[model samples]
Structures are given as C-alpha cells and as structure tokens.
Target: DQTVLAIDIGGSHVKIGLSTDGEERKVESGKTMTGPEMVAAVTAMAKDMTYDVIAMGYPGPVVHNKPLREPVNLGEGWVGYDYEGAFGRPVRIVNDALMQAIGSYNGGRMLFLGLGTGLGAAMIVENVAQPMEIAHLPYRKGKTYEHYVSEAYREKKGNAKWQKRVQDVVERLSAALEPDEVVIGGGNVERLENLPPKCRRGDNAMAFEGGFRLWKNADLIV
Candidate 1:
C-alpha cells in the first residue's frame, strides 16, 4: 500500500502527518513563511519519514491544484512554486478550507467554515468541493466578513460580541447556501458558547484525512 504525506499549511502553523489516523507534526508559520522556506521546513521535518505521495492544503485560493494567488498572511513566492519538484513526489494541492471540507463531508450538500486568523470557507456538493472567498466580501457597515468574525475582531470586540457576529455570519451564509450540513472548524472554534443550528464542530485533524482521500477517492473532486 502506498503511503501519503499530508501537509496543512495555515497562517499560524503548518501541520503534517504521514497518515490520517496518527499524531501530526507541527511547525510555527507566520508572515515570514515563503514557498521555498515552507518546503525546506517540511523537508527537514519529514526527512526520516517515508511516503509515496504528497497532498498539500494551501491557505489561499488554489486553481487547478495550484495556488492562484499568494497567501494573504504569509510571504510571497507561493503562486508559481514547484511543489512536485521540491517534494520529489506526485502532489495534489487545494485550498486549505477545501481540504478540511472534503473530510467533513458526510452526504449531500456541505458547507465548511474555518474561523481562525481569518475566515476560510468551502462547499462540497455531491463530492465536488468548491473553495469560496466570502471573507473579503461585504458583511455590515462597509466592513468585511473577516472584519467582524476573525481573530483580531474577537480580541478587539471581546468574545460576547464576536460570537454574535459569528452567529450572524453562519445564519446568513447558511441561509444563502442552503447546504445539508455546515461544519465549523479552525483554531478559534472552541471559543464559541453555542453553535448555530444545523452546524457541527469540525476537527482540524480531518484535513489529513481529506488529504489521504484525495488520492484514494477518484469520485471526489476539489
């Protein structure tokens, strides 16, 4: 059986795992992280591990398995990076939110939202995952969705108001999308007191499961 190395690149940290059911290795990632630097760091971490393929979840929009633009938080050099060459293995890439969404999928239409440093969103309809950019869109009073629901906003406005904003976001978005299931995940998911209706908490570990599934499930698309 072939093994897979799943990499989940985030704004605060990069997580990698050799399998879907094991402990992951993590490294701090910040504004200084670049495409080359990330490759180097991952290579160093996985030097002793053996895997036949690679699956990476990038923290930005990805088109055709490649990053369409540089990450908003991390340093540049990601858009045209040679990931397959750097890792020396066949690699599949998708938006970080889409990767998590794939694993969160149960059946029918699914919506995945990641509430972290910023908002990340994706939708899966009949196994086809579509990455979304709702974070930058207008939400209220000329502010974006991210301005109201993200980490900095949480800190600035306190958890009470932040949770309401999250609720408003979830309700409005879920209403518009009309998905069968809504999965809320990310670093700050635990901070909320009560989850909105028709929504469930998602595990960050599922990102790796989605990564593995990317290779095994021919019917699934991202």
Candidate 2:
C-alpha cells in the first residue's frame, strides 16, 4: 500500500513516520535537530524512502501554506525555505498543535493542547485545522498560557501548581473554544493525576496519522 511521509518538528526532537489509511507504521526516530542540521537530517531520511505526499508539523505559525514565523525554541531560517523542493514532493505544513487537533478530532469542533517544553494550542472546526498561539496570550499573574503550562513553568511552579494550571487552562480554553471535545498531548500530559472528563490523552503516533488524513483525497504514494 502507498504511504505518506509525515514529519513532526518539535522544540527538541523531530519525529518522522510513514502513514497510510489513517494508520501509522513503525516510527522512525532521529536526534534533536536544529538550524541547518534539520535540513540534512530530513534529507538523509528521505533518501531511500518513497512517499506520495509530505506533511510537516511545524512548531510555529504558518502563513500562505508556508511557515511564516520561527519557532522560539528552534533556531532561525525556517520561514522561507523551499520545503517542497527539499523534500522532492508536494508538501503541506501546519502547526504541530493543529495537526494534533486534527488527529484527535472524531468530528465537530475540537481543541488540542500540547504540553511539552512549551504550551501549544490548536483547534479543528469541522475537520479543518487552525493553529492558535494562545500560549502567549495574557493569563493570571501577568503570565501567559506558556508561562503556566510549559515545562519552564513546571520548574518554576512545581508539579502541584503545574497540574492545577493545566486544569485551569483546559477549563478556560474549553469555554473559549466551546469545543465538542478536547484532547491533550505532549511529554507532560501524562503527568496529570486526574484526567479531565472532556479531555483525552493523545497518541504520539497520531501526529503521523493526522498527516495521512491531509492527503486521503489525492492520489499519493510513499
């Protein structure tokens, strides 16, 4: 069967996988990639692989079908790069959080929150994904969602407060999005002592699953 190549670029790691029919196969692992290193790593990974489409989950806002902003955690120079040219295939790039939202959505409005090194937010309206930088929005105590929901905040506030903050953010974001469902994923999501009723833990493999969904309509190969 044909497969799609999906890349999820994060603050510290880049996850690459092959997906087909909403199912992801073995996940290929790579080291922490940053700056020019990212290009080399991705190129090397694609050398022997054949994929019909490429879907990238970037860490920041993407504009006009390209990444318009840089990820604060990663180095610069990602905004204007010819990703399609580099991959030697048609490419679709979206925010990582938004991709997670897409993966988590069963139907209807859905909200996704990624709690990793930083807080990432995204929404899916009728299966169309929209990445949001709600983490930077103002929050209590002159802080922001990232300030309270990120790993940085966990270190500053300790596990107890961090957990509470996650709950708080979920409540507020749920109200704001009025989502039919909410999914939380990331390295830190497992830390929650009691998972929220409306929230579910997402699978890491879902990132690639989401990528595959992006090209289901087209005749693609991998």
Candidate 3:
C-alpha cells in the first residue's frame, strides 16, 4: 500500500503524519508557526520524510485550489506563498475544516464545522470539499460565528454556554446546508453534551485521514 505525508496547520499547532489506507500514523508537530516562521517549521518537520504525496490542511478560504485568504488566528501572507517550494515537493492544500468533512464524508452532500481555537467551516458536495469562512459571517451583537463558537467563546462564556452555542450552530447549520450529514470535529468538540440529531462527532484525526485520502485518490480530484 502506498503512503503519503500529511500536514494539518492550525492556530495552536501543526500535525504531521503518514497517511495510508484511511489511517494516519506518526503524527507530530511543533508549536504554532507564525509569519515566515511557518515555512521553516514546515520544512523542519517534513525533513527526511519521503512519500508519494504531500497534503496540507490549512485554515482559510481556498479558491481554485489555492488559499485565497489566511485566517486571523495565523500570520499573514499565507495566500500567495508557494507551499511546494517550502516543502521541496509538490503539495496539495485544502481547508482544515473541509478536509475534516472529506475525511468523515460517507456519501452525498455534507457540512463540516470545526470548533477549535478558531471556528472553521466547510462543505462537501458529492465528496468535493468547498472551503468556506463562515466564521466571520455576521451574527448577533456585532459578533461573528467565531465570536460565538470559537475557543474564545468558551473562555468568555464557560463550558456549559459554549456547548450550548455549539449545539445551536449545529442546528442552524443543519437547516442551512440541508446536508446528508453534518460533522463537527476539533479539539473542543468533545466538550459538547450531545450533537444535534443531524450532526455527528468526527474523529479529531480525520484531518490527516482526509489528507491521506487526497493523496491516495489524487486522480479523483482532477
């Protein structure tokens, strides 16, 4: 079985792993890399690793197979950088939340919301991940989805209210996407008391699983 190298970049940390047969192994990383430091950290983590494909899960809006904007949680200038150049190999990048969706997708259309240090959102239509930044969308009291659903919200509102907010988001998303499935996954997802009827908890490692899926099935994407 062929293997691929997968990297999931986030605000707090990066996860590096080998992906094979829908599973991930040797997941590792350093502290969050901000600014130009991201390039160096990625290079160091990927050094001495050889795989058939390199898959990156990033936090932002990706347009035309490229990141069009970087999230505020991470440093700037991520959109135009040559990821392949930094890693010394061709790389495929997708939104971290979207990758989670792909990793959990069974069939049909789906929505994925990653509630972590930051709120990440994505949708999958017929198994194609569509990167979205709904976190910044308008919400109550001059707030955004990120304000209500992100880790910051937990800090301000406490775990009980935070979990409520998550449930509310899930309910709303279910109606908005009308998807065949809804996946909620992230470091914070376990805090929820219960997922909405239409929503399910996804494995935190699904990000790597999705990266592996992309590498193993590159032909399907094209």
Give the best candidate by lDDT: 1
| Model 1 Cα shift for residue 36 (angstroms) | 0.9
lDDT of 3: 0.74
What residue pairs are clashing in model 1?
none
Q: Scored by CA lDDT, what does every candidate get?
A: 0.89, 0.75, 0.74
Give the poorly placed runs of model 3, Cα more than 4 Å off.
Answer: 20-36, 218-222
lDDT of 2: 0.75
What C-alpha RMSD separates each model from the true structure? 1.3, 3.8, 2.9
Model 3 C-alpha lDDT per residue in residues 76-183, reported as the tens digit of each score: 767788777766666887778877777777777778888888888878776566777787788678988788888877988899999988877777777777887788
lDDT of 2 by residue, 1-222 (tens): 457788888766677777743423332333334435676677676666667878888888886568877677777768788877766788888888877666666777778889888888888776566778887799888987788888988888899999998999999988777987788987787787888787888876778777777666342211
Arranged by TM-score with the best first, the candidates are: 1, 2, 3
Backbone clash count for every predicted candidate, in the order shown: 0, 4, 0
Give the C-alpha miss distance for residue 160 in model 3, angstroms: 1.3
* TM-score of every prediction relative to native: 0.96, 0.87, 0.86
Q: Which ten residues in a row have the lowest lDDT in candidate 3?
A: 21-30
